[PDB]
Design a protein around this ligand. Structure first.
Ligand SMILES: [Mg+2]
Ligand SMILES: [Mg+2]
Ligand SMILES: [Mg+2]
Lengths: 134, 114
RNA sequence: UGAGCCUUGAUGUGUAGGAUAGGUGGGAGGCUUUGAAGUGUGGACGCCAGUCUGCAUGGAGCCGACCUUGAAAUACCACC
RNA sequence: CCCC
RNA sequence: GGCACGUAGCGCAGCCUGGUAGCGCACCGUCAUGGGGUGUCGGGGGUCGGAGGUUCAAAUCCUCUCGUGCCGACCA
């Protein structure tokens, strides 16, 4: 159904096993199979019901290592597309770039939230099987 | 193409553009092209401006758009001044060309309301 | 035998207009020989307009950007 | 269908 | 607290399940008939109870509100 490429990268991760932070920065060389500076996307699953006008999010990220000042905004259903950078930008520094992202959000945590704000952080790759960390 | 200032009678024959001009009709165009010395077998897109300004000068002898409706309105103000039957009828917004009014004037009196 | 549910399968005619296109949206190389585009046809959905899969003949060839769209392609990837 |  | 009704004069679809107020009765003027009705034919007649937001746009989504219901709860 596929070529040799797509299958071995899906057989290098686990979706039923929600990976961890320090375990996450080992596999993005096995999740990077492109002949350029390929990107790595992040998704943030959220824990509010945004069907109400009061729950829009909007802000800019001061990147601790640049890429770099990127804006963001949540979704109406609870999953926002963000980014940490690329796969070659010092994977070990990618964890420290994951650090600075989310601590800025809980500071601007909206007061009209219902339930828990965050749900899950998927540090996924652009050309491989995603990773959903707690 | 420019005659009269505002009207563009493009691709109209020499006298057809003048019949289609604002102010005059069927025979005054023939009269204009006879007083100016031009034939009526070609469109306006072939005659140069050396004669179009002459046509616009020659048509400057009749009543034009700005005085057409204003002479009409001077007459209508004479109607609003006198009080005669055609002032009374005209002051009720009623059709425009003769005498019969009872049973059939419906196009210019509008459709039936109820 | 319904309910909740992971994986997978798989999904939501607008008109515009290459285009059955969900909210975003990182994104320009995937694709390719663990064995092409066109076709040979059994099956699925269908407002049946089109999406589209098993074994293949063909067997190594297309495309993101490339134009008109409230929208760009679901090329990869992302959680629902 | 009603009625003269 | 908890869910169900508001849509032309009347009864409702659509509903308080997404893009474009529709059906029936009522009313007006025709046609149908020797005279009438049913019937076909057109025309008015409402902006979805009110407000506020999401939209490429609400009626059809969400919040408050209004009138009416029904279940339940209620030890200044
Ligand atoms: Mg009259
Ligand atoms: Mg008899
Ligand atoms: Mg009491």
């Amino acid at each position: 159904k596929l070529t040799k490429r797509m299958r071995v990268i899906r057989e290098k991760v686990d979706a039923t096993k929600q990976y961890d932070i320090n375990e996450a920065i080992a596999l993005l060389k096995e999740l990077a199979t492109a002949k350029f500076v390929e990107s790595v996307d992040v998704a943030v699953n959220l824990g509010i019901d945004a069907r109400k006008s009061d729950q829009n999010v909007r802000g800019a990220t001061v990147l601790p290592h640049g890429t770099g000042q990127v804006r963001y905004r949540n979704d109406k259903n609870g999953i926002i597309h963000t980014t940490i950078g690329k796969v070659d930008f010092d994977a070990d520094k990618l964890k420290e770039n994951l650090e600075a992202l989310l601590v800025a959000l809980k500071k601007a945590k909206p007061t009209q939230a219902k339930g828990v704000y965050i749900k899950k952080v998927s540090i996924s790759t652009t050309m491989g099987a995603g990773v959903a960390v707690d | 193409a420019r005659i009269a200032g505002i009207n563009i009678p493009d691709h109209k024959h020499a006298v057809i553009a003048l019949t289609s001009i604002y102010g005059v009709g069927k025979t005054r165009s023939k009269a204009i092209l006879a007083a100016a010395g031009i034939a009526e077998d070609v469109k306006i897109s072939e005659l140069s401006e050396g004669q179009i300004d002459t046509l616009r000068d020659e048509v400057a002898k009749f009543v034009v758009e700005g005085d057409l409706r204003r002479e009409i309105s001077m007459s209508i103000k004479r109607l609003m001044d006198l009080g005669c039957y055609r002032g009374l009828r005209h002051r009720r917004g009623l059709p425009v060309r003769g005498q019969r009014t009872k049973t059939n004037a419906r196009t210019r009196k509008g459709p039936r309301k109820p």
